[PDB]
Structure 1
């Protein structure tokens, strides 16, 4: 009770159960999600409770891309019609949080799982995005593909792709990635974009190496968006990713 040094030394003999400890780590750890699960939950929930779930997905992605990942807050800021729509989504799909536990739907999550739509929608959306294409073309030495300008793009990169092309894309995505982060957190913000990286690198690999999509799928997606050619040789704008992505 009163000898602190000895109280502390006595901890050598305190129990340290692996099972209980890991159980704590399981509870304290950020857990990922399975994209596969998200796709299931959306559908089941939507189909259960209405409803044209395919639309909902597209709406959610838009919201997310435009407004970010906190839907409740979003409603406060917008039109009555707009807010009304959202009410339906929160109610129907139980949208919740940011990165809570597994098995729960989140707009950023939806964006990831259904990323094949997401990259399509980026085009029409470029300038209502928190970082615009236009800035990015300047920041870039060229036209920076709109399809990349969200995190979920990470979900379709194949590292295993020849010539480190997969690697390249990661770099070129990151370039966008900096800016995005100084955003979802006002700060954050320019801790030379290295600590901004460690900010995202961890769920970015996690998406990049998720096996939800096969290499064949990725290749097929990458071509369709014009990020790649049948020969699998990416465009020049990427090349400019890139070595550019280095300095920072």
Structure 2
């Protein structure tokens, strides 16, 4: 009858600070959990998950995220191996649900071996090692993939942490321009806005301890015992600010 009464009576009901906060927690934007990726890898692989993940790292770094597209233009042995992975690990393309697996997600979740693989697969990347060497004097190979952001230790000192991030952002700038054609004509600031959000999210993520993250950067020879980066890292940081 009177929808006036119904609306005020609904508003008159006391707002529960805990009930509303329990809803926002439930209706929260489900972020990228590396923990779910490894949980799914074991769910489909079991024992073969480690050997198959190594194949998927190479696959994501050299070809891409679209598995049924790369399958077409591939060797007889390769096409069969890829087709098997799509059927076994229920691999998809793009950005699907949290419960789904992609080549981009495997490589990003197992960032440790992914950065090590970059030293080997330097000239098979969308942006080759020689291309990056022409922009910055001997660019770090371990920084040549968006998954490196997950290896960055945020507990690093101010200037040292900023130098690493601005050195890695040199590749991100060159990477985004290659894989996305509409970002070629746009300015540095426009490209920066596209990759800064998931980059910093990986740096400040709960996955991989601050102690082990720093050890990984030390192992790749990016920073010393204290935390001071290499001359090449510092050179790439200055190169990123000068280049557009």
TM range (shorter): 0.7 to 0.9
CA-CA distance at 1:136 after TM superposition? 0.5
1:203 is matched with which residue: 191, 198, 215? 198
Structure 2 equivalent of residue 172 of structure 1? 167
Structure 2 equivalent of residue 5 of structure 1? none
Which of structure 1's runs of 4+ aligned residues deviate more than 3 A?
none
Q: How many residue pairs are counted as aligned between the two chains?
A: 225
CA-CA distance at 1:241 after TM superposition? 2.2
Partners of 2:154 and 2:210 within 8 A in 1: no
Structure 2 equivalent of residue 41 of structure 1? 40
CA-CA distance at 1:190 after TM superposition? 3.5
Partners of 2:164 and 2:229 within 8 A in 1: no
In 2: Cα distance, 1:156 partner to 1:166 partner: 12
- Residues 130-157 of structure 1: CA deviation (Å, up to 9, x unaligned): 10111111111x1111011000000011
The answer to whether residue 148 in structure 2 is matched with residue 153 in structure 1 is yes
1:72-221 to structure 2, matched below 5 A, reads 72-140=68-136, 142-221=137-216
Partners of 1:46 and 1:52 within 8 A in 2: yes
In 1: Cα distance, 2:77 partner to 2:121 partner: 20
Alignment gaps of 5+ in structure 2? 1-9, 11-19
Query: Which range moves more in the overlay, 202-211 or 126-135?
Result: 202-211
Alignment gaps of 5+ in structure 1? 1-14
TM-score by length of 2: 0.85
CA-CA distance at 1:186 after TM superposition? 2.0
